[PDB]
Design a protein around this nucleic acid. Structure first.
Ligand SMILES: [Mg+2]
Ligand SMILES: [Mg+2]
Ligand SMILES: [Mg+2]
Ligand SMILES: [Mg+2]
Ligand SMILES: [Mg+2]
Ligand SMILES: [Mg+2]
Ligand SMILES: [Mg+2]
Ligand SMILES: [Mg+2]
Ligand SMILES: [Mg+2]
Ligand SMILES: [Mg+2]
Ligand SMILES: [Mg+2]
Ligand SMILES: [Mg+2]
Ligand SMILES: [Mg+2]
Ligand SMILES: [Mg+2]
Ligand SMILES: [Mg+2]
Ligand SMILES: [Mg+2]
Ligand SMILES: [Mg+2]
Ligand SMILES: [Mg+2]
Ligand SMILES: [Mg+2]
Ligand SMILES: [Mg+2]
Lengths: 57, 50, 181, 31, 461
RNA sequence: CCCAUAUCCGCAGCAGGUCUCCAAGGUGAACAGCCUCUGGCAUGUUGGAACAAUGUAGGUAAGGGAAGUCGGCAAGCCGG
RNA sequence: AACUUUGAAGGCCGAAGUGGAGAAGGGUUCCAUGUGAACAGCAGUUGAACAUGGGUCAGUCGGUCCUGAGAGAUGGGCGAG
């Protein structure tokens, strides 16, 4: 496959090289965005559990 | 659980589809105010209750 | 973008700033006060010693609890520390200011840190879990940093072993460049 | 497959200590 | 790699380049530069080269466009690029993957044509295709090499100008087509006069028709001669060219559209088209260069071992010298079977010989296409890597199954594209169409490209 | 798919709670404790350098042996 | 790059396990690829995070059926309802 190709390359020179074609490409791209966000609950409190009960009757 | 009812499995699926970010073209609408899906859910942070 | 001070001779100056940097504000305020007034080469060498614990930053104002070290005696102080993140953040900013001097065609080897300022940025909210079913704030304390570098008459070249290092290529930088190109 | 190959490759890999930064990605150069 | 990328280094630092446009240039500004650019090239296509008198012959240079500043044509640039991607695609040449090394790589591919420009010129000067260097000397050779250097040098910048958004598309494609379109219209409206034993008459098929229809008493004879000249353009050769044009237009649009999307962003649906002519015109081009030299090679071979039945059975050769110039035709054997008919009746005379050629010509291009893809770097794996590099992916697929889905079509679109490429090229060669089936495809393709850009601009132009 | 020192409930990747099945070799009365194979893990939401006081958890103490203290609390003796 | 991965050591859980599977509960946390902005009380090239796409296939495994403790219509009774 590589041998046969090289022989083609050699023959392209001289008279018959004047006949040729064009190459090819396919690249492409698009737009970019970057927002974010994620919720959760709201905290609580006021459990009321003190312990230092010393009755000084 | 694995043992599921049809009604529960269906209710879960609707919760699955709602849980996605907004289309980015929504930002380019004329009077648009929304910046992100503010109704997102996480399976750990907040629970469905059913 | 307004700096707190106007340069004395704007054509002979280069600017640099950053906002919302996640480096402790109290540590960075002390680190900036150490290099203020330094020649750029001297300042760069000093913050590379703070990284390696060969020169301390004196903690003068925000010094509650800070320990004593032998290197603090250089600054006429007893309390010093070696903030690595603040030292590295300020080096990156010096590099940027140095580049801005080059773009303006200034003599980079004559630059002096004329003005440098650390400001608190809006705090970031995390939390920590306390006893008896309580939750408390866990605030990061970021900062805005702005510096102005000016040409003076004392010239100090770059160290020889420093300019001898390879221009490290970034594979990940290339990958993004391919996507756009 | 011969089980002594495990030892041979382990010791060969332990020889990379001297050639840090130029380790050959594949020793089986053929293919 | 090491002694090729760095050898370019010293020279690309001094060679010039075209500047990036600051902003996106206006279309009506693009059109202005394009029309200017095309006009200059066209002017080069006619100016005769300076100091060429001995041989190509001078009278033809008056007729001709051989001998113009485009004498070496855009061929060096096209051959320069193909040889690069050919070696680069095969991994034989290693291309620096960075944009800066890519920007140099462009200069390297530019450098080849500049090399090929001098190399191709030297071949034509020494052999006498302009004349002996003794007759011309250094000075005349100096100017001719310089001029042949500047024209390709100009041609290079002008294409690079269009390539970089100062115009539309690329110059080289624009240039080759304009030649093709001009040849077709010229051969229909050429006011050239041909001096015959029947008298003096015009060449252009459309021009020749009305000139003959009045100049001949036998108006049926005009119906015959006007459309059936066997040494001059005919309205048929126009009709043959027009008929092919439509069919290529039909098969130009053939393509298998694969769905793909960005692996980094929702929606954003797009598609990767596997074009049926997947291998462009390269397969048959390589095939033709093979056949032509096989005729030359056999000629020299068969003059030394003609007495050996194997060399004769390989391919025989004679010298047709009756009247016209000595032209080398094959007499029999393989090369005889590898030749196309020159007359319609000849196909009828030998039915087997024609089918043997066609199977060769369909099989060769088809086989060329199939083998070309792997080397050219357009096989599925290479395509998949480009898509991976661009962060694209087929929805629902892993990156590996893309190769499985691409191999559904690419290997087959290779062969059938080549077989279709040849088959339509047989019609182009058989029915006397102008420019060969390669040329019409080139023309239709390019005009199609500018059209689809043109309509997009018309949306707001 | 998780099924729990991170997919469940305790505001959390919380030393808590939360129903089950299978179940190797040695010592040994033993599904005890100790070591190990199959399987698994990376020390439990960080690291480095020191080895002050005071701690928390482990130890050892001459001679005496509850004289300590509200009280032998604690530890200790015993142990198959 | 102290923390990711592979290799080699040294260790631990020690078949009432830090192993292999389920019920209840969760509800996509599962799998592949990508990011390393916010989160993962240091970091991270990593993650149960975020982003883009996938994945649960039955006459025979369960439900489906039976009735258990019980719940509950009609007839009837009561009841302003
Ligand atoms: Mg929970
Ligand atoms: Mg204090
Ligand atoms: Mg303290
Ligand atoms: Mg709690
Ligand atoms: Mg420990
Ligand atoms: Mg650890
Ligand atoms: Mg834990
Ligand atoms: Mg802990
Ligand atoms: Mg004692
Ligand atoms: Mg004693
Ligand atoms: Mg007493
Ligand atoms: Mg007492
Ligand atoms: Mg006791
Ligand atoms: Mg498991
Ligand atoms: Mg388990
Ligand atoms: Mg963290
Ligand atoms: Mg996972
Ligand atoms: Mg079956
Ligand atoms: Mg029932
Ligand atoms: Mg009832």
């Amino acid at each position: 496959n590589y041998i046969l190709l090289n022989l083609a390359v050699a023959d392209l020179f001289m008279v018959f090289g004047g006949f040729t074609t064009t190459l090819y490409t396919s690249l492409h791209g698009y737009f970019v965005f970057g927002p974010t966000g994620m919720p959760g609950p709201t905290p609580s409190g006021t459990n009321v559990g003190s312990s230092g009960r010393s009755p000084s009757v | 659980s694995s043992h599921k009812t049809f009604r529960i499995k269906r209710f879960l699926a609707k919760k699955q589809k709602q849980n996605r970010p907004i289309p980015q073209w929504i930002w380019m609408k004329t009077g648009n105010k929304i910046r992100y899906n503010s109704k997102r859910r996480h399976w750990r942070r907040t629970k469905l209750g059913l | 973008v307004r700096y707190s001070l106007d340069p004395e001779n704007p054509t002979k100056s280069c600017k640099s700033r950053g906002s919302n940097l996640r480096v402790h504000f109290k540590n960075t305020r002390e680190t900036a006060q150490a290099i203020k007034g330094m020649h750029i080469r001297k300042a760069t060498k000093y913050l590379k010693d703070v990284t390696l614990k060969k020169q301390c930053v004196p903690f003068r104002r925000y010094n509650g609890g800070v320990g004593r070290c032998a290197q603090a005696k250089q600054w006429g102080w007893t309390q010093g520390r070696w903030p690595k993140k603040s030292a590295e953040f300020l080096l990156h900013m010096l590099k940027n200011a140095e580049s801005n001097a080059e773009l303006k065609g200034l003599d980079v080897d004559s630059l002096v840190i004329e003005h440098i300022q650390v400001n608190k940025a809006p705090k970031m909210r995390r939390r920590t879990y306390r006893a008896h079913g309580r939750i408390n704030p866990y605030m990061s304390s970021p900062c805005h940093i702005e510096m102005i570098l000016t040409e003076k008459e004392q010239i100090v070249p770059k160290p020889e072993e420093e300019v001898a290092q390879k221009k490290k290529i970034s594979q990940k930088k290339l990958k993004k460049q391919k996507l756009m190109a | 497959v011969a089980k002594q190959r495990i030892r041979m490759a382990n010791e060969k890999h332990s020889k990379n200590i001297t050639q840090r930064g130029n380790v050959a990605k594949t020793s089986r150069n053929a293919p | 790699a090491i002694k090729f990328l760095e050898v370019i280094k010293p020279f690309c630092v001094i060679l010039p380049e075209i500047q990036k446009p600051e902003r996106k240039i206006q279309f009506k500004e693009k059109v202005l530069w394009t029309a200017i650019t095309l006009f200059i090239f066209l002017v080069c296509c006619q100016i005769p080269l300076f100091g060429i008198m001995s041989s190509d012959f001078y009278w033809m240079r008056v007729i001709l466009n051989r001998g113009t500043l485009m004498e070496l044509g855009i061929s060096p640039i096209v051959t320069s690029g193909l040889i690069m991607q050919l070696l680069a695609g095969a991994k034989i040449i290693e291309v620096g993957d960075t944009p800066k090394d890519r920007a140099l790589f462009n200069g390297a591919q530019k450098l080849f044509g500049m090399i090929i420009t001098i190399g191709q010129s030297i071949v034509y000067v020494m052999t006498g295709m302009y004349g002996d260097p003794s007759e011309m000397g250094a000075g005349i050779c100096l100017l001719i090499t310089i001029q042949l250097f500047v024209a390709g040098l100009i041609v290079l910048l002008l294409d690079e100008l269009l390539q970089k958004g100062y115009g539309l598309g690329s110059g080289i494609s624009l240039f080759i087509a304009t030649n093709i379109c001009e040849t077709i219209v010229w051969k229909a409206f050429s006011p050239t006069t041909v001096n015959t034993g029947r008298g003096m008459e015009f060449e252009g098929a459309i021009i020749a028709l009305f000139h003959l229809l009045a100049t001949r008493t036998d108006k049926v004879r005009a119906l015959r001669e006007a459309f059936y000249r066997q040494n001059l353009p005919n309205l048929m050769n126009l009709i043959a060219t027009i008929f092919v044009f439509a069919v290529v237009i039909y098969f130009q649009g053939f393509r298998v559209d694969l769905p793909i999307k960005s692996a980094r962003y929702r929606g954003q649906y797009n598609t990767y088209p596997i074009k049926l002519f997947y291998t462009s015109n390269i397969p048959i081009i390589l095939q033709s260069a093979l056949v032509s030299n096989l005729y030359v090679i056999s000629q020299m071979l068969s003059a030394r071992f003609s007495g050996n039945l194997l060399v004769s059975l390989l391919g025989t050769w004679s010298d047709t010298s009756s009247g016209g110039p000595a032209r080398a035709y094959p007499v029999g054997g393989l090369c005889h079977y590898l030749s196309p008919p020159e007359s319609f009746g000849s196909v009828l005379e030998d039915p087997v010989h024609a089918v043997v050629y066609i199977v060769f010509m369909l099989g060769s291009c088809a086989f060329f296409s199939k083998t070309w893809i792997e080397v050219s770097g357009s096989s599925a794996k290479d395509v998949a890597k480009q898509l991976k590099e661009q962060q694209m992916v087929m929805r629902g697929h892993r990156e590996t199954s893309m190769v499985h889905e691409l191999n559904r079509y690419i290997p087959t679109a290779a062969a059938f594209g080549g077989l279709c490429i040849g088959a339509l090229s047989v019609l182009a060669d058989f029915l006397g169409a102008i420019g060969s089936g390669t040329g019409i495809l080139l023309a239709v393709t390019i005009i199609y490209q500018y059209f689809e850009i043109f309509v997009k601009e018309q949306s707001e132009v």
